[PDB]
Design a protein around this ligand. Structure first.
Ligand SMILES: CN1c2c(nc(N)[nH]c2=O)NC[C@@H]1CNc1ccc(C(=O)N[C@@H](CCC(=O)O)C(=O)O)cc1
Ligand code: MET
Ligand SMILES: [Zn+2]
Ligand SMILES: [Zn+2]
Length: 746
C-alpha cells in the first residue's frame, strides 16, 4: 500500500504560524487557536486520504514540537514551572516551549542532521511521570470521526530518553536510560486507549537506531520492546528510522524486537541498509520503503524508484512491501502549487510535500498493476529536460575539473610569517577591536543607492567616533539574508515564493534552490565594500559568506555529491575575494556560520566531510596576497571535536563565540595544537538586550590573555548586531573599546 511517515504542520500559507503568534500576543483566544488547528489537521488528513494513501499519520501535528509533545504525554514538566498534575494544557505547554515573564523556556537543540530544532527534555531521578496529555488518542478519534482512520505516531520510549538530558543537579553518574521503568507504564496506558479507540496500526519513531550505538544501549531497546509486547498485542506495530542507514548490530536488534511487525527504512539517505536486508530479513514482516525524499525539493525518479521497489518485492512482495517517504515531510515545503513565479520548466523538476504524497501513491499503484501511464510520462519528460538542459550542466564543470590540483593551501608564507607583511600593510595596536558584520536595522524600504549609502556612513562615522574600533564594517544594510543576497547573484540558483520549512516554534526558513552549476557572473560585493573604504582612514573588511554555509542552508541538487557542488560555489566566491582585493580591500571576512551543519550522522563519515568542507574554504582565498588579511567567523563555542579542521582552514584571524563559556576551554588552541594565528572569542553576547559593563569585558579579556597568547588576541562581539537595538549596541561596544585601551595601558 502507501504510507507517509509525517507531515508539515504550519499550513500551505503558514496559517499555524500566525495563529500561534496571534494567540501569544493576545490578539486572539485559545479557542481561536484550536479552530485553526483542527481545520489544518482535517484538510491534511482528507488530503492524504483522497490521494489513496493507505497509512495516514496521526499525531504528527504539533503546536511547537513533537518531542515537547511526548514530554507533555509523560507529565515530565520541569520543577520551575510549578506544575501540579492533571491534563496539561496550552499554558504549561508554551510555558515549557517559550517560557514566561519569570521562568525561562526549555533548551532547544538540532534534530539529528536536519535544519529542525526540538526541545530537549530535562530528566532526573526526581521527576514524577504520568499520563498528562491525551493528544494522541484525541487526534485518532478526531480523524476517526471525520471518516479517515489513522496510524498514531509516537516518539519511541528509548529514543526519547536518548534524546533527553539530565536536569540541573542530577549527578554525573546518572544514566538516563534508567528511567525506562518509569515511562513504559505510560506508553502502555496510551497504547491501550488507542486500541480501545479502534486503532489497528501504530507507529513508533526510533530514529536513534541510525546513530552509532554501543551494545549496552542497543540492548535497552530489546528490553523495552519485550516489556511492551503484551500491550502491543493484536496491533500492527511499525518502528521507524530515518536520516541514515542502520548499523549492522543495530539492524540485528531492530529486526528482532518483540511486538514489532513492520520496519521503516530511509532509502534515500540510508540505502546502505539494503545490503543488510538482502543478507536477511524477518519472515512475514512488512517493509516500509522510504524512497520518496522527504528532505528535499526535487521530483522523484519514478523509474528508478520502481526498479528498487520491485527488487524489494522480490525479498517479500507478499503484500508486505509498503511504499513510503524517507522521512517526515516536516522537513520539506508544503505545496508546489503555490509557486506562481518559477518557470514551468524548473517547477517540473520539483515536488513539495503535497506532491510527494501523490508520488508515493502513484508508485504504489504501479506495483499493484495500475501504473498511471500519463504520470510516469511527464516524470520521465521532466527528468529528461533536467538532464539535458544547459541551465544545469555548464563549463564551470571544467573549471572544477582543474581544482583537483592536489590541495589549495594558501601561498606557503606560513600564516605566522604572513601576519608580518600584513601588520606592515596595516599596523594596529595589540588586542585590536572590531565587529562581526552587521548592525541594527531601522525603517526599511523595498535613488536607491543614496539611501543605502546614508545608512553606511552612519555605521562608519559611528565606528570611527565609537571610541575607536581599529577594524570597521559597512553594516550589511543592503543585505536581507546572508545566504540569499549572494545566491541571487549566482548562476545555479533559483528562489521560491512560498517554500517555507519549519525551523522551530513559529519560525520558518525559505531555503534558496541550487538547481545547476553555480558561477559568479559579475562583481557582487565590490561596489559597496569599495565605497565604504574611503569614508574612513581605517581598515574596511569586505564581507562574504563561505561556500559551506551557502550549501547547507539551501535545497541542494540531488544529482551530484554535495562537495562537488560546494567546490563550484567556492570557485565563484574565490573571484569576489580576488576582486575585493583588486578593489583595495586589504582585510576580508568570510563567515562559515553553518560549517558543522552538514556533519554526517555516521561518525566514521566525519573525516571526509570536514575535509572537502575545509578545502572549499581555502579554494576561496588560496590565491590572495600575503599582505591581504583573511578573517573567518563561525557560530560555535565547542571545538574539542573539530579543532584540527579550524586549523586546517588556515585563516589569518578567526572569530567564534564563547562569551558565556570558560576562557579556559580556549586551551584547546594550545596544548598539542600550537595554533598561533589571529583569533578572538566573544566578549559581548549579542543575544541579550542587556549591557555588559566595561569591567566585565576587560575581565574576560585578561582571562583569555592568560590562556590564549596576547600576541594575537582580538576583541569582538559574539556575532552580528542585526537582532540587537542601537540603544543596546551603542554603550556595550564603547565598553569593549575602553576595556581594551585599559588592558592596553598595561
Ligand atoms: C540562522 N539559522 C537558520 C537555520 N536554518 C537555516 N536554513 N538557515 C538559517 O538562517 N539554521 C540554524 C540557525 C538558527 N535558527 C534560526 C532559524 C530560523 C530563524 C528565522 O527565520 N527567524 C525569523 C522568522 C522569519 C519568518 O519565519 O518569517 C525571526 O524573525 O525570528 C532564525 C534563526
Ligand atoms: C550569523 S553569521 C554573521 C553574519 C553577518 N556577518 C552578521 O554580522 O550578521
Ligand atoms: Zn556568529
Ligand atoms: Zn589536517
Amino acid at each position: 500500500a502507501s504510507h507517509i511517515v509525517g507531515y508539515p504542520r504550519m499550513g500551505p500559507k503558514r496559517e499555524l504560524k500566525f495563529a500561534l503568534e496571534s494567540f501569544w500576543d493576545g490578539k486572539s483566544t485559545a479557542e481561536d487557536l484550536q479552530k485553526v488547528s483542527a481545520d489544518l489537521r482535517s484538510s491534511i488528513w482528507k488530503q492524504m486520504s483522497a490521494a489513496g494513501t493507505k497509512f495516514i499519520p496521526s499525531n504528527t501535528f504539533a503546536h511547537y514540537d513533537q518531542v515537547l509533545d511526548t514530554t507533555a504525554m509523560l507529565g515530565a514538566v520541569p520543577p520551575r514551572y510549578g506544575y501540579t498534575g492533571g491534563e496539561i494544557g496550552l499554558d504549561v505547554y508554551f510555558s515549557m516551549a517559550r517560557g514566561n515573564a519569570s521562568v525561562p523556556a526549555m533548551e532547544m537543540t538540532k534534530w539529528f542532521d536536519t535544519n529542525y530544532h526540538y526541545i530537549v527534555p530535562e530528566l532526573g531521578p526526581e521527576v514524577n511521570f504520568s499520563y498528562a496529555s491525551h493528544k494522541a488518542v484525541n487526534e485518532y478519534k478526531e480523524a476517526k470521526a471525520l471518516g479517515v482512520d489513522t496510524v498514531p505516531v509516537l516518539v519511541g520510549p528509548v529514543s526519547y530518553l536518548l534524546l533527553s538530558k539530565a536536569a540541573k543537579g542530577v549527578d554525573k553518574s546518572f544514566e538516563l536510560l534508567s528511567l525506562l521503568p518509569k515511562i513504559l507504564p505510560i506508553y502502555k496506558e496510551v497504547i491501550t486507549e488507542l486500541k480501545a479507540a479502534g486503532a489497528t496500526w501504530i507507529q513508533l519513531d526510533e530514529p536513534v537506531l541510525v546513530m552509532d550505538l554501543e551494545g549496552q544501549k542497543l540492548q535497552a531497546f530489546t528490553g523495552a520492546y519485550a516489556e511492551l509486547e503484551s500491550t502491543l498485542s493484536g496491533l500492527n506495530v511499525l518502528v521507524e528510522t530515518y536520516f541514515a542507514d542502520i548499523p549492522a548490530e543495530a539492524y540485528k536488534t531492530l529486526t528482532s524486537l518483540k511486538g514489532v511487525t513492520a520496519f521503516g527504512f530511509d532509502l534515500v539517505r540510508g540505502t546502505k541498509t539494503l545490503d543488510l536486508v538482502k543478507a536477511g530479513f524477518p519472515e512475514g514482516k512488512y517493509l516500509f520503503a522510504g524512497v520518496v525524499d522527504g528532505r528535499n525539493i526535487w521530483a522523484n525518479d519514478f523509474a528508478a524508484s520502481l526498479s528498487t521497489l520491485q527488487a524489494l518485492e522480490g525479498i517479500v512482495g507478499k503484500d508486505k512491501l509498503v511504499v513510503s517517504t524517507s522521512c517526515s515531510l516536516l522537513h520539506t515545503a508544503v505545496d508546489l502549487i503555490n509557486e506562481t513565479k518559477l518557470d514551468d520548466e524548473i517547477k517540473s523538476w520539483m515536488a513539495f510535500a503535497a506532491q510527494k504524497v501523490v508520488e508515493v501513491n502513484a508508485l504504489a499503484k504501479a506495483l499493484a498493476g495500475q501504473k498511471d501511464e500519463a504520470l510516469f510520462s511527464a516524470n520521465a519528460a521532466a527528468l529528461a529536460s533536467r538532464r539535458s538542459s544547459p541551465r544545469v550542466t555548464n563549463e564551470g564543470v571544467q573549471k572544477a575539473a582543474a581544482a583537483l590540483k592536489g590541495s589549495d593551501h594558501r601561498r606557503a608564507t606560513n600564516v605566522s610569517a604572513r601576519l608580518d607583511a600584513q601588520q606592515k600593510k596595516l599596523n594596529l595596536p595589540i588586542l585590536p577591536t572590531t565587529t562581526i558584520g552587521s548592525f541594527p536595522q531601522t525603517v526599511e524600504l523595498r535613488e536607491d543607492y543614496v539611501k543605502a549609502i546614508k545608512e553606511e556612513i552612519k555605521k562608519v562615522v559611528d565606528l570611527q567616533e565609537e571610541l575607536d574600533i581599529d577594524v570597521l564594517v559597512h553594516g550589511e544594510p543592503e543585505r536581507n539574508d546572508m545566504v540569499e543576497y549572494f545566491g541571487e547573484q549566482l548562476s545555479g540558483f533559483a528562489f521560491t515564493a512560498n517554500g517555507w520549512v519549519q525551523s522551530y516554534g513559529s519560525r520558518c526558513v525559505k531555503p534558496p534552490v541550487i538547481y545547476g552549476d553555480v558561477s559568479r557572473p559579475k562583481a557582487m560585493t565590490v561596489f559597496w565594500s569599495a565605497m565604504a573604504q574611503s569614508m574612513t582612514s581605517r581598515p574596511m573588511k569586505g564581507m562574504l559568506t563561505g561556500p559551506v554555509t551557502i550549501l547547507n542552508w539551501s535545497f541542494v541538487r540531488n544529482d551530484q555529491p554535495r562537495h562537488e557542488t560546494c567546490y563550484q560555489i567556492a570557485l565563484a566566491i574565490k573571484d569576489e575575494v580576488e576582486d575585493l582585493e583588486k578593489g583595495g580591500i586589504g582585510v576580508i571576512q568570510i563567515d562559515e556560520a553553518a560549517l558543522r551543519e552538514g556533519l554526517p550522522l555516521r561518525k566514521s563519515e566525519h573525516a571526509f566531510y570536514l575535509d572537502w568542507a575545509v578545502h572549499s574554504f581555502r579554494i576561496t582565498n588560496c590565491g590572495v596576497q600575503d599582505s591581504t588579511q583573511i578573517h573567518t567567523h563561525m557560530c560555535y563555542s565547542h571545538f574539542n571535536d573539530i579543532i584540527h579542521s579550524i586549523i586546517d582552514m588556515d585563516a589569518d584571524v578567526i572569530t567564534i563565540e564563547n562569551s558565556r563559556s570558560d576562557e579556559k576551554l580556549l586551551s584547546v588552541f594550545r596544548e598539542g595544537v600550537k595554533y598561533g594565528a589571529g583569533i578572538g572569542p566573544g566578549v559581548y553576547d549579542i543575544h541579550s538586550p542587556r549591557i555588559p559593563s566595561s569591567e566585565e569585558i576587560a575581565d574576560r579579556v585578561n582571562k583569555m590573555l592568560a590562556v590564549l597568547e596576547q600576541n594575537i588576541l582580538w576583541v569582538n562581539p559574539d556575532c552580528g548586531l542585526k537582532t540587537r537595538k542601537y540603544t543596546e549596541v551603542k554603550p556595550a561596544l564603547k565598553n569593549m573599546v575602553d576595556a581594551a585601551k585599559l588592558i592596553r595601558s598595561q
